[PDB]
Design a protein around this ligand. Structure first.
Ligand SMILES: NC(=O)c1ccc[n+]([C@@H]2O[C@H](COP(=O)([O-])OP(=O)(O)OC[C@H]3O[C@@H](n4cnc5c(N)ncnc54)[C@H](O)[C@@H]3O)[C@@H](O)[C@H]2O)c1
Ligand SMILES: NC(=O)c1ccc[n+]([C@@H]2O[C@H](COP(=O)([O-])OP(=O)(O)OC[C@H]3O[C@@H](n4cnc5c(N)ncnc54)[C@H](O)[C@@H]3O)[C@@H](O)[C@H]2O)c1
Ligand SMILES: NC(=O)c1ccc[n+]([C@@H]2O[C@H](COP(=O)([O-])OP(=O)(O)OC[C@H]3O[C@@H](n4cnc5c(N)ncnc54)[C@H](O)[C@@H]3O)[C@@H](O)[C@H]2O)c1
Ligand SMILES: NC(=O)c1ccc[n+]([C@@H]2O[C@H](COP(=O)([O-])OP(=O)(O)OC[C@H]3O[C@@H](n4cnc5c(N)ncnc54)[C@H](O)[C@@H]3O)[C@@H](O)[C@H]2O)c1
Ligand SMILES: O=c1[nH]cnc2c1ncn2[C@@H]1O[C@H](COP(=O)(O)O)[C@@H](O)[C@H]1O
Ligand SMILES: O=c1[nH]cnc2c1ncn2[C@@H]1O[C@H](COP(=O)(O)O)[C@@H](O)[C@H]1O
Ligand SMILES: O=c1[nH]cnc2c1ncn2[C@@H]1O[C@H](COP(=O)(O)O)[C@@H](O)[C@H]1O
Ligand SMILES: O=c1[nH]cnc2c1ncn2[C@@H]1O[C@H](COP(=O)(O)O)[C@@H](O)[C@H]1O
Lengths: 389, 389, 389, 389
């Protein structure tokens, strides 16, 4: 019985798999599809799994999930639904300042019932729903920010492809002195050197990803960006040294990508395309080839840039369509159950525990070859029907 | 004279290829498609090749092949046919306890003739066919297990996606105390750390693979699993230290995948999709686009979970169809002859010899690039017809 | 302020140094002099440090220190003194069976006072001092073992240069069936492959080291042995999987070697030359060139083999002398204070905690070049006097 | 109990240490002092160890030991004694042809008794002692070789610092056509490329080492040679492909160097300095500072090149003295017992088995750091006396 004397509270666990530190040592360009998380020990049911998540230094959500500040994803209906599910939405800024402040006002005034329960409903002190908003880094964004702070916005995201700029750092120093209470997320960043300049400017969170988004062409136009899994791991590991949470933003096609982003050190995950074409996503449904579709586009797509408007405009995103997904109040419970089940197979009873296992090297990972990615999908069938829930 | 003095019973063999230990040192995600086994020396005919296989610590099969405990693969007709061919079948548990015990009873009472010959017919002491059954890890599975042990079941498989759980370890300790004679296979596991907890619980065999199965989506939903060749090699090497055989389960598309699974240290191989849509697989044939198909589905697909029905259910598998393959009594002889010719090209006269050559580093392997996998398949033709036998 | 959300109970610690696994990855021949342990965090005084140590599966000492079964180190006076200090002594077997049983009898009958205090005095259930004895693997050792078990010996060490033998495994099986209460330490071993056979034979502890001891010539005579730090790490890691403690035996010149041996996974440390030429070490003091010396010799030295006696005898050790060190009741408190201060600088409040930090990767090491070993000694002085306490 | 089914005749052995192939992969300059052989499993007594050794393609000695063709080591008294002990001696050629043929004649005419027993006495078909002789690669060496073959010499060594020459290859072709029965050892070589040219010329054995010998200065004069352990391993591995045995020549200070040389693939070991200053070594004893010494010198030392004398001669060796060792009939039994005990600790019951274990990867090695070489010698004593037997 005296095994406790020879190694204390450890006990022997066979070594198998790679720590996150080893998984990224090779300096390949790993994205979420390129690796798996190895199963752990299960000693809890999947419903016990705590999804409590830092959005910023001060704001805590009960679900890691965020709707992206895009004009085809997040206006007040999306922000209300995401808050009720225990995430948040950032109202997009491809609209007039007064329009965006009116969308924020609708979220802050919602009250519910003015039929279901929302035990994760992600409220502020006054029992109003939490709301985020995007702003740019121009001089008009100072006026927009006056209106949004008057409308009771809880958190601001500085909304750029490349947040490591004098323009953004000046905007951070301006917000943190004029509205010291206001939580500011800087971004986008993909390197620790970008993250250090915004953390030194005093941001309360970071938004991580460049390229990677489903509608994005920044990598093939600008040559610039990073494989998103590697960016999330590198920026989360840097931001963690300063107590700064990160949002893994863009490239999330599946529940398994969400679990990978959280496991690599993201505190929250931001989705455009996964929440696009829901009932709460702005714009109308339409039929093309007998499929109920809704528009979805990059904010640096030409039609997104033509709205509300150096002579030649470089596209950084595409405009397209996503098939109807139903309602956020149906889809986000599927994401929550999928995340909890993923955490349960991993043996983490909490997302804070999941990241603690990753940084301690208790959590183990495994690379996938191309043939392993084929083997991990559906293969060898004549036909099949992938109904996820 | 001098050769024996200078190096004993060795003699010089040029070094070429990698040992299994070197093949997996790189920590890539190798699956079966990612590597080849190098040819050895042939000094026997392929019909000399002994396919004798440990299923558990106590049970030996004269052939390595197992039918998977799936409701579209293994009821009594499959289990009878697989036993007569010298494998075994595990009766699925997506049915009431009395139905599954009646399927087991039909296997144990079969006798043959109540006409081919079955010199590998895989029988117990009383000359009844061997039968396996699946059970879960709930409290109803204790009653199910009582009925199955009354029906004379020879071996139990504990049937989970992630067998390293308190629920499963408790079910192992319960079976081994109440039914000490009964052989228990634990699983599914893909890591040695999972394998150690079930081997310490006292399982008699392990079932290896998570993801990998043709109908499986656990990797894209849960983020969790392993490339199956790597999982088989790692878990077989760990389980071997304790005298525990392993079943390589799922991702077997070809005879070459079976030979690879056995070469990597699997004692037996379990198939769903390769034995699905045979005459003995449960369910009816049907025609769609002029092809004779039969249903094949994951046990964690939604329509499989609906049978005999936490409000939102997460799919871990798809539902689909496989093209008709004929009869087990035709197809399993093709698998046996294919395994024997593979062993003959390798220079192993037995599967025990094959694994001994692998652990001693006598058996050599070679990685395949993507261009080598293309080169290894059919290429450069206008059209062709792949008639396998 | 929610830093706990982003990484749970870990918290950020800069990475510096190597884990023990990395320190031995290079496959150099590291001994204790070849590496340092890096300092940790101090949150306790050195006297709080708990030195409770497993000698075997069942026996616990309150100090990690053992006197070696050598005829110039351990008879009853050494064994009494080492037990009173909270270690143990193994009575040597280079004597008649009746003489060794009489030495053991003197330890078991001691009582104290028939005046310092001994709060670590390392007693049995009946409040007698613990005593070990050595035996060989011949047929006369069965009679010797009968006398020693009648004399009330608590633990047996099987005393060979190379314990992985049929002769030794047979002696283990013989002891464990005839004397099932009796604790057996196997050895000497230096590889996990040797440790496997003795652990499978059923030893309760292992003695680790071959060559390495101050009087050793086994390496330049037999070509056979291992660098002792590497042997301790590799055998302790293997033995830990089975709950078997290890004794790091030989090559301990300093307190820092003891702290290194314990950090590398040794449960206890065995000393010959460090405890030789104390007042309790057998044999007389003598003067040569004006220095008070006592004889110290290997048990495979020719004069040690000439005592109590294939015509040509191979020496495996030398015969020599050590300068007088005083008394065990003065020297072992210096070793204890040195071990506790080493643990305090490391940041481990217990030896069980120290090994837990090492296996978990929290304890970091650092290799020393030859120039770093020079820099870590006394250097650049005209003269100096190294008074240790 | 079917553990044989899962891995055949292998059985599980924990991997620990390096195979010889891995030990030399790093391309350091390992000599014998730089590595250890790890202990194996002992299932035999050391006297069972068979030391039967190929000298050439045709000649077998019962002991691996050869006296070097040096004028301070091997004339007829040494060659007789080495043959009676079950090695051989090569009579040196720093003499006139008639003198060397008379030394060979005395060995071939010896008979014994014209009283110990010599069960290893290393005779030819006619029950005469085996004798070797050296020759050079000049035209006078053709006449010398006529006389030596008339005197009944059994084996010739071609005696050069650098055997990969037109002069030596011509001499090999000349011997093999004029005396087809006569066994020829080529050398010295240290690379496989040198070995390939002499093996293609048709030598029956190789002599391996350049520098390394105790009296060597070839490395600091010529810049040319190899670390002897590495040379033995490389040349033995190459020569083994053709069934050619190797002599490891020079740098043998200890029994452990002999066991290392044999384990690295040497079939026999050649000694100068270890057999110098024995009673059978040519030259007289003399006293200097009260020590009974005998001269020992390199054959390329100036005073060795003066005997039997562009104009400037380069020393390749030193002239010196060795302390008296006694008689070959006392010392060679110590070498034999030391080799057998080293083999017993390693777990090889034969030298053919030892080399088979090394090439198959079963024999494991371990590098020594400088601090491990210190720890492996005598350390931490005031004084000591190293009596070897
Ligand atoms: N994450 C991505 O990979 C990514 C890539 C492209 C676009 N987007 C999104 O599309 C939208 C537009 O992105 P963007 O980066 O093109 O917008 P942006 O306004 O940040 O940048 C456009 C250009 O204006 C410059 N700029 C910004 N503020 C300035 C100031 N005060 N003075 C002078 N120049 C200034 C920028 O450096 C850049 O050259 C945002 O919603 C953004 O998140 C995201
Ligand atoms: N590739 C694979 O290995 C794989 C992947 C997915 C599903 N499957 C198969 O699909 C079927 C279902 O797999 P599964 O893992 O979903 O079934 P499962 O019943 O093992 O697990 C379902 C859930 O219930 C939990 N659970 C199990 N026993 C419990 C108990 N007593 N109390 C409380 N909670 C308990 C589990 O931890 C898990 O959260 C099986 O046939 C399985 O083999 C296999
Ligand atoms: N550093 C070390 O670990 C080391 C090295 C050398 C010696 N020593 C010590 O010196 C002493 C002698 O060591 P040793 O290994 O020479 O003693 P030993 O008795 O274990 O071995 C001596 C020889 O006898 C053989 N032998 C042992 N039992 C036998 C049996 N029943 N039948 C036949 N042969 C048998 C062994 O295999 C070996 O060849 C011990 O105190 C030992 O601990 C220790
Ligand atoms: N460690 C060693 O291997 C080593 C090193 C130096 C010397 N030695 C020994 O010292 C002795 C002398 O060695 P050596 O190599 O100096 O002797 P050597 O006669 O082989 O070489 C001396 C020189 O003469 C040349 N030579 C040889 N045969 C020739 C021919 N027919 N025509 C023209 N040139 C020819 C050689 O190439 C070399 O330049 C030998 O006993 C040898 O084994 C050994
Ligand atoms: O026009 C664009 N080009 C590049 N990236 C964009 C653009 N518009 C939005 N993004 C990014 O894409 C993310 C959404 O990606 P998705 O979830 O994969 O669809 C957003 O949150 C932005 O970071
Ligand atoms: O619903 C499911 N999801 C994931 N894996 C499954 C599911 N049902 C069965 N499996 C696994 O898939 C294996 C069969 O894989 P196949 O032989 O490649 O078709 C089974 O034996 C199970 O381990
Ligand atoms: O004759 C011998 N040769 C080699 N090792 C020995 C011999 N006798 C004892 N030993 C070992 O040396 C250890 C003591 O080493 P020391 O503490 O460094 O002096 C003992 O416990 C034995 O393992
Ligand atoms: O003059 C010389 N220089 C260098 N090596 C020599 C010389 N003479 C003999 N040797 C080598 O030294 C070996 C003996 O080395 P030892 O046994 O270490 O003393 C001989 O067999 C030769 O290969």
């Amino acid at each position: 019985m005296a095994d406790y004397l020879i190694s204390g509270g450890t006990g022997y666990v066979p070594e198998d798999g790679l720590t996150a530190q080893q998984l990224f040592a090779s300096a390949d360009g790993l994205t979420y599809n390129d690796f798996l998380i190895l199963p752990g020990f299960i000693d809890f049911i999947a419903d016990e799994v705590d999804l409590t998540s830092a959005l910023t230094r001060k704001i805590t959500l009960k679900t890691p999930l965020i709707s992206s500040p895009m004009d085809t994803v997040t206006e007040a209906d999306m922000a209300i639904a995401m808050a009720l599910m225990g995430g948040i939405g950032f109202i997009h800024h491809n609209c007039t300042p007064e329009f965006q402040a009116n969308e924020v006002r609708k979220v802050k005034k919602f009250e519910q019932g003015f039929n279901r329960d929302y035990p994760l409903a992600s409220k502020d002190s006054q029992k109003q729903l939490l709301c985020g908003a995007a702003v740019g880094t121009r001089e008009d964004d100072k006026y927009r920010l006056d209106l949004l702070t008057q409308a009771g916005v809880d958190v601001i995201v500085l909304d750029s492809s490349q947040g490591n700029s004098v323009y953004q750092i000046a905007m951070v120093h301006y917000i943190k002195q004029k509205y010291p209470h206001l939580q500011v997320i800087g971004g986008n960043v993909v390197t620790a050197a970008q993250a250090k300049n915004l953390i030194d400017a005093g941001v309360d969170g970071l938004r991580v990803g460049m390229g990677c988004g489903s509608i994005c062409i920044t990598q093939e136009v600008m040559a610039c960006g990073r494989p998103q899994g590697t960016a999330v791991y590198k920026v989360a590991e840097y931001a963690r040294r300063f107590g700064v949470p990160i949002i893994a933003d863009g490239g999330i096609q599946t529940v398994g990508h969400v679990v990978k982003a959280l496991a690599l050190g993201a505190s929250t995950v931001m989705m455009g395309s996964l929440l696009a074409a829901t009932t709460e996503a702005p714009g109308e449904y339409f039929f093309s080839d007998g499929v109920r579709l809704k528009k979805y586009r990059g904010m640096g797509s030409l039609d997104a840039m033509e709205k509300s408007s150096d002579k030649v405009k470089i596209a950084q995103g595409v405009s397209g369509s996503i098939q109807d997904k139903g309602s956020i109040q149906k889809f986000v419970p599927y994401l929550i159950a999928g995340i909890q089940h993923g955490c349960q197979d991993i043996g983490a009873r909490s997302l804070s525990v999941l990241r603690s296992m990753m940084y301690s090297g208790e959590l183990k990972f495994e690379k996938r070859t191309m043939s392993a990615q084929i083997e991990g999908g559906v293969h060898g069938l004549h036909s099949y029907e992938k109904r996820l829930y």
